[PDB]
Amino acid sequence: DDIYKAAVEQLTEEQKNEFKAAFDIFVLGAEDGCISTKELGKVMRMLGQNPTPEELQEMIDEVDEDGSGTVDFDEFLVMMVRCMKDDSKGKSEEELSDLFRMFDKNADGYIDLDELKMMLQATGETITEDDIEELMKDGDKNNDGRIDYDEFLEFMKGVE
Amino acid sequence: GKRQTEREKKKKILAERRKALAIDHLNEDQLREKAKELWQSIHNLEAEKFDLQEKFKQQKYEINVLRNRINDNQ
Amino acid sequence: TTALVCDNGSGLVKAGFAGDDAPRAVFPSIVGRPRHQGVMVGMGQKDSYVGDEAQSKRGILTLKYPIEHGIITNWDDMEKIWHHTFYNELRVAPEEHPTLLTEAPLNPKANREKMTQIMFETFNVPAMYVAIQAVLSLYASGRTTGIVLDSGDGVTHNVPIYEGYALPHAIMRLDLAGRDLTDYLMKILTERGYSFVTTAEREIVRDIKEKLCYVALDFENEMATAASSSSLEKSYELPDGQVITIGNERFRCPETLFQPSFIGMESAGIHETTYNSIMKCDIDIRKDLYANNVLSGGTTMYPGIADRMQKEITALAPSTMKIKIIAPPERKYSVWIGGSILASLSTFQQMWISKQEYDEAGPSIVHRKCF
Amino acid sequence: TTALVCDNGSGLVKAGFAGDDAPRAVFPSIVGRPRHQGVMVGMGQKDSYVGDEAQSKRGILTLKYPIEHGIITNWDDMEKIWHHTFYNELRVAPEEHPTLLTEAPLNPKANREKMTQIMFETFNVPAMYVAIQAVLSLYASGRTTGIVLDSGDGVTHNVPIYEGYALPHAIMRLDLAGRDLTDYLMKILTERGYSFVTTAEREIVRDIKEKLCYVALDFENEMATAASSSSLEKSYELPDGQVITIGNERFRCPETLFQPSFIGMESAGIHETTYNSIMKCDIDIRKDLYANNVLSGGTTMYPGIADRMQKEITALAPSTMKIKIIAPPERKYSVWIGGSILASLSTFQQMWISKQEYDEAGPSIVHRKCF
Amino acid sequence: ISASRKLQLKTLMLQIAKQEMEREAEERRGEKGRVLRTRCQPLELDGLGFEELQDLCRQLHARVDKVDEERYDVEAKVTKNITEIADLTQKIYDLRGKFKRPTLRRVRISADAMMQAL
Ligand SMILES: Nc1ncnc2c1ncn2[C@@H]1O[C@H](COP(=O)(O)OP(=O)(O)O)[C@@H](O)[C@H]1O
Ligand SMILES: Nc1ncnc2c1ncn2[C@@H]1O[C@H](COP(=O)(O)OP(=O)(O)O)[C@@H](O)[C@H]1O
Ligand SMILES: [Mg+2]
Ligand SMILES: [Mg+2]
């Protein structure tokens, strides 16, 4: 969404040098970026980042949607920067505790995924296929019929 | 742990350790000043005990969460 | 609101709301401070584990019961036990619930007065009432007469009751109980090589006693049989392996009840103090007491005691009277079931010691009309 | 600021800043003065090469370890080693960094007091803390119970811990370790013709031991097999050629751990001092210690030791208990990883021995509450 | 699954969180002022004689003692249940975070970048 566009706008130069080193290493002369996912993963490892082998597989399986290997550096670098963590721990657990204190309108020691739906609807936000279903599925991820405090934590932990 | 000590502590804070003082034995302006001062101090104490009740509510909610986590954890 | 039927006991604290069938939370009454040094930092080590938590960390604790023989010897620990019982095992604040404690007969006054003072000052209950542990066990049987032998873990007492009129001059309280049987078993196990010394290993010996020991119908014949055959030797696996084999220690441990000379006590067994308690009663209610002998308490759960006791009393009693021993399967919680029934009665609802009454007469109110 | 987690050890000094995964600089702890005369002028020849520099010029030096068995026997050399560690391998002045040394259990007091006095007077650190080398190795495993066998290069010690409460009466410290195995290997190599005598060639024998030796699962069968076939003879190239072939010396060198009678020591092997250390513990925590036996230290890196030790303990222990031996792949640096974790804790941040405290009570502060 | 979904969800969640934060803060301020007003009854600058001054002064001294004892008592209750809450926090951490304690590390950071040292 707009987050990746903004991140593109606010390109950090310290990471920009690493990405251009990747450009130098992978590109072999007017190279249109065939997306060597092995090369991309080794580049991520070399540049100090610690991508998971699962992240490596995700990058393997989420590339070359054009089918021609050669990929615009725009979306490639969007994937590269977002795969790299750029955030601070996603708020504080005490902050989350106080927020849940606000959000326990049911006052039953927890909140509800249905309560989450009602509050988000009260926020007047778009609900779609990307919304609605998996939002409540992962809010009450353990599927207790309601979102416990730890469930609310694990729904959106480490996210800005 | 010698609940006699706890009882005597409570009673001292009730009567001795609390700022208890006979003061309505003074001249006019001074008496008004002292009355205003004590009333304002007790008003601040009203604010303090209102927050005491508020945070006690919060602790009750926290123990509700605590029991919830306990039950979900076993 | 509902009443809290607590039952301090000595060895197992049994509690629960009035009007149910079984206590909600049953857990040993032990408070054990750690005894070693402790090197891990931030492990969250507390200073005293009470209740059932200290039966799992007992390897590094020094468990000590706060109730010796009915009486309470360590008031701080007992207060800690009560606080745990109210807040963590039932999770009901005591400010909104009447309480019904239980107390053995013939106990020191100061114990009862301190109990009521604690309940009214520290926990600040609305109203509490103290009842004798045998009348409740008679409630639970659904009788109204009968002589009840409530052999707990601290003290064994034998209260005869007729038509609802208790006979205060015929109560025979004897201080042999389950704890002395545990100590005697731990002392006779040393005759095979197994030495249990630590206060934590007393729990292991208690488990051995519960699971293996039984009361012999005839003592001499069993002693002769166990000394010739080997059909009695039952084995048991310690908490670490190294199984042990108990021979004629099986029926010698609970035999102490009928021959208190084994542990050096002078008095007569539980088979003869019941007959003496009956004979102190009037001559016209002895038949009913003979026919309605009630057993209660934990220690009367030994397999085969309801027959040995009947045989002994039939030997002592006149040949014409019929001797019947009531041994309900819910023996252990009989006192608490009776307590629940008593607290659920409408006629009893005005016998509680209301707090304003305590404020006017002090803790000595318990000995007064509100008994 | 960040803390310096130094770990003196005996054989390899491991150091690094708190909060990382591996020590920053690992180098042998040897200080070797030159022994020949020296004829080139202006070559810039120093008077003592310490650390990893003296493992490259060892041909003309006389290396001598400053730590014999845990204890420190030559304080000037140890001070030199510490100075090198701080200034050249980490390049951080000690005036701005807390330090966390490590010490074996049951060591002389004077050693620890002199260590703290040096750290506070010569290097002038802000605050230092001394920790037992086994508790850290238990930290690194992420456990909170378990009995850890930390077979270093100087001394092998076996500290049992339960629920964070260390058991001071069950620590079994044995002075057989990697150095004695090196000497015994150097002594049995002479049975084929290879003679290593110089203190420099002890390093070559150590390399042979590290690269070739392994612990046999069953000793007699291996002795019989190596005496008939020749499938075990592995060759190794000295620092100058002349390859050597090690026969049944391969599994006879590390077998000394389980039979200390080989080097004339009386005591029982590391397979039986662990069982003895367990049996001294209370009867209720033996199952947990059986299930969480932890290995650490360098010398426990022999290929095939985690199976031999488990077989031996299973032979000794009761048949019902489950015996499990935790052998993490990062065994060598386990103590230092645990030290980093402990120094990174917030709860631990107030346990350091602050300098003003030392100024008020002298070096004997270490035995006091700040342990 | 698109992470833009999570980004949008967190935007809405942050909006809800801030709204409820300001809402509860404002509620607390208003209710606090209301309670103080209805309880801290004003003291007046005129209308009482010296005898009336003394009378109302000692009456409010008694009222001050009443509310001071009440608030100290409830403060003691707050402290004791707060100790209990702390104990339960320790216990629940022992329930959950006992094994998570060693998990805290910052590792394999610099030594991976030290191949040119030799
Ligand atoms: N199934 C059993 N078999 C034999 N003895 C038992 C059994 N259950 C409990 N006991 C003994 O009874 C004691 C518990 O008695 P209990 O009735 O709880 O005492 P109290 O009157 O204090 O509640 C235990 O200490 C144990 O020694
Ligand atoms: N891979 C290995 N295989 C066998 N033995 C080893 C190995 N690595 C180290 N050792 C032995 O362990 C010793 C190092 O032990 P270490 O844990 O460094 O001792 P310390 O506790 O003093 O740090 C060396 O002297 C060596 O004999
Ligand atoms: Mg009883
Ligand atoms: Mg070591």
CATH code, domain with D40: 3.30.420.40
Per-position DSSP letters for D42-97, written without gaps between them: SS---S-EEGGGGGTSGGGEEEE-SBSSSSBS-HHHHHHHHHHIIIIII---GGG-
Structure tokens belonging to residue C368: 């007064």
Chains D and B touch (3+ CB pairs under 8 A): no
DSSP letter assigned to residue D3: P
- The resolution in Å comes to 5.6
Contacts of E83 (CB under 8 A, 6+ apart): none
Contact between chains at A104 and B68 (C-beta distance less than 8 A):
no
Positions at the binding site of A for Ca(2+): 64, 66, 68, 70, 75, 104, 106, 108, 110, 115, 140, 142, 144, 146, 151
Please name the residue that has the structure tokens 């706890």: B6
| Ligand 1 atom 2: residue of nearest CA | C210
CATH code of the domain containing D183? 3.90.640.10
Are C87 and C199 in a shared domain?
Answer: no
> Are D72 and D154 a contacting pair, CB within 8 Å?
no
Residue E101 has its nearest CB partner, among C42, C46, C87, at C42
Ion ligand 4 residue ranges (Cβ < 5 Å): D 9, 152, 335
Are D42 and D131 in a shared domain?
Answer: yes
Q: What's the per-residue H, E or C state across chain C?
A: CCCECCECCCCCEEECECCCCCCCEEECCCEEEECCCCCCCCCCCCCCEEHHHHHCCHHHEEEECCECCCCECCHHHHHHHHHHHHHHHHCCCHHHCCEEEEECCCCCHHHHHHHHHHHHHCCCCCEEEEEEHHHHHHHHCCCCCEEEEEECCCCEEEEEEECCEECHHHCEEECCCHHHHHHHHHHHHHHCCCCCCCCCHHHHHHHHHHHHCCCCCCHHHHHHHHCCCCCCCEEEEECCEEEEEECCHHHHCHHHHCCCCCCCCCCCCHHHHHHHHHHCCCCCCHHHHHHCEEEECHHHHCCCHHHHHHHHHHHHCCCCCCCCEECCCCCCCHHHHHHHHHHCCCHHHHCCEEHHHHHHHCHHHCCCCCC
Length of chain A: 160
Structure tokens belonging to residue C184: 């005697």
Are C132 and C25 in a shared domain?
Answer: yes
Are C9 and C78 in a shared domain?
Answer: yes
Q: Which residue type sits at C273?
A: T
Burial class (CB in 10 A: 0-12, 13-18, 19+), C336: buried
Phi, psi (rounded to 5 degrees) for A58: -60, -45
Task: State the smallest CA–CA distance between residue C303 and chain B in angstroms.
Answer: 35
Cα maximum dimension of chain B: 68
Structure tokens belonging to residue D144: 């909170």
- Elucidated via: cryo-EM
Are C182 and C131 in a shared domain?
Answer: no
Question: DSSP strand E in chain D: where?
Answer: 13-15, 25-27, 31-34, 49-50, 61-64, 99-103, 127-132, 146-151, 156-162, 165-166, 172-174, 234-238, 241-246, 293-296, 325-326, 353-354
Distance CA(D195)–CA(D208), nearest Å, equals: 13
Q: State in Å: Cα C30 to ligand 1 middle.
A: 14
Q: Which residue type sits at D36?
A: H
Distance CA(E101)–CA(A135), nearest Å, equals: 31
Are D132 and D220 in a shared domain?
Answer: no
Distance CA(C335)–CA(C149), nearest Å, equals: 12
Phi, psi (rounded to 5 degrees) for E88: -65, -35
Distance CA(E93)–CA(C44), nearest Å, equals: 8
Q: State in Å: Cα B73 to ligand 2 middle.
A: 42
Phi, psi (rounded to 5 degrees) for C164: 90, -5
> Are D178 and D302 a contacting pair, CB within 8 Å?
no
Q: Which residue type sits at D128?
A: M
Structure tokens belonging to residue B27: 């001249």
Q: Which of C78, C215, C208 is nearest to C151 (CA)?
A: C215
Tell which E residues from 89 to 118 touch C, by Cβ distance under 8 Å: 90-91, 93-94, 98, 101
Are D133 and D8 in a shared domain?
Answer: yes
Q: Which residues of B touch E (CB under 8 A)?
A: 10, 13-14, 18-20, 22-24, 28, 31-32, 34-36, 38-43, 45-56, 59, 62-63, 66, 69-70, 73
| Any atom of ligand 2 within 6 Å of the Cβ of D178 | yes
Contact between chains at A123 and E7 (C-beta distance less than 8 A):
no
Coil, helix or strand at residue D217: coil
Please name the residue that has the structure tokens 């809450």: E85
Cα maximum dimension of chain D: 73
Are C103 and C10 in a shared domain?
Answer: yes
Q: How far is CA C250 from CA A56, C177, C219, C223, C331, in A?
A: 68, 17, 12, 10, 22
Are C9 and C128 in a shared domain?
Answer: yes
Are C114 and C190 in a shared domain?
Answer: no
Distance CA(E101)–CA(C343), nearest Å, equals: 48
> Are D206 and D182 a contacting pair, CB within 8 Å?
yes
Distance CA(E2)–CA(D351), nearest Å, equals: 48
Distance CA(D84)–CA(D237), nearest Å, equals: 32
Q: Which residues of A touch B (CB under 8 A)?
A: 100-101, 104, 107-110, 142, 144, 148-150
In this structure, how many other beta carbons lie within 10 angstroms of the beta carbon of residue C112?
19
User: Looking at beta carbons, which residues of chain C come within 8 Å of D347?
Assistant: 41-42
The vertex-E116 CA angle with E114 and E118, nearest 5°, equals: 100
Structure tokens belonging to residue C148: 């009840």
Beta strands C325-326 and C293-296 are parallel
Are D38 and D103 in a shared domain?
Answer: yes
Task: State the smallest CA–CA distance between residue E5 and chain B in angstroms.
Answer: 29
Distance CA(D34)–CA(C150), nearest Å, equals: 89
C69: left (phi over 0), alpha (psi -120 to 50) or beta: beta
Q: Which of D318, D305, D320, D319 is nearest to D269 (CA)?
A: D305
Q: How far is CA D9 from CA D53, D73, D91, in A?
A: 18, 13, 20
Q: Which domain holds residue C212?
A: 178-256
DSSP letter assigned to residue E41: P
Distance CA(E83)–CA(E51), nearest Å, equals: 47
Query: What is the count of residue pairs from B and E with beta carbons less than 8 Å apart?
Result: 105
Are C9 and C130 in a shared domain?
Answer: yes
| Ligand 1 atom 23: residue of nearest CA | C9
Phi, psi (rounded to 5 degrees) for D201: -75, -15
In this structure, how many other beta carbons lie within 10 angstroms of the beta carbon of residue A129?
8
For helices D270-279 and D305-316, give the axis angle rounded to 10 degrees. Answer: 50
Structure tokens belonging to residue A76: 């490639």
Structure tokens belonging to residue A122: 């009260």
Q: Which of C359, C367, C357, C343 is nearest to C101 (CA)?
A: C343
CA E55 to chain centre: 39
Half-sphere exposure of C39 (CA within 13 A, CB side): 22
Q: Which residue type sits at D94?
A: P
Distance CA(C93)–CA(D47), nearest Å, equals: 77
